């Protein structure tokens, strides 16, 4: 898992270092958009 | 060779961690 205190509340680890909760699906869909931008 | 490739992105991740940890150490030194 991503670095954080008592990970299964007040964790104060680094911000913007590792992958994010989600939104990788969103960027994958945007990449799919870019793939479909030429055909 | 594919395994070596994925270890190369592991190395890139580690160098990014290097930069971030240097920044964190400097910030903590400021305090």
């Amino acid at each position: 898992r991503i670095v954080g205190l008592d990970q299964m509340s007040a964790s104060k680890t680094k911000k913007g270092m590792f992958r994010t909760v989600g939104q990788l699906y969103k960027e994958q869909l945007t990449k799919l958009m870019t793939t479909l931008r030429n055909t | 060779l594919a395994a070596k490739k994925q270890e190369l992105e592991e190395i890139l991740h580690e160098m990014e961690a290097r930069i971030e940890e240097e920044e964190e150490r400097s910030q903590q030194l400021q305090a």
């Binding site: 509340s9 007040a10 964790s11 104060k12 994010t20 909760v21 989600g22 | -």
Partner: protein, 48 residues
């Protein structure tokens, strides 16, 4: 601009102190100005 649902979750996840009800109220307050979110406030059970 005022963040969308996905963006608001993006900030909300990283907060140290947070809860579902506070997030819902904050979303309603920040997006109550916009007229593209229809609402029917007879159901205050976080269904909007």
């Amino acid at each position: 601009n005022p963040p969308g649902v996905l963006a608001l979750l993006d900030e909300e996840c990283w907060f140290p102190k947070a809860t579902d009800t506070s997030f819902v109220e904050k979303l309603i307050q920040e997006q109550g100005n916009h007229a593209k979110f229809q609402k029917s406030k007879q159901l205050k059970d976080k269904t909007e």
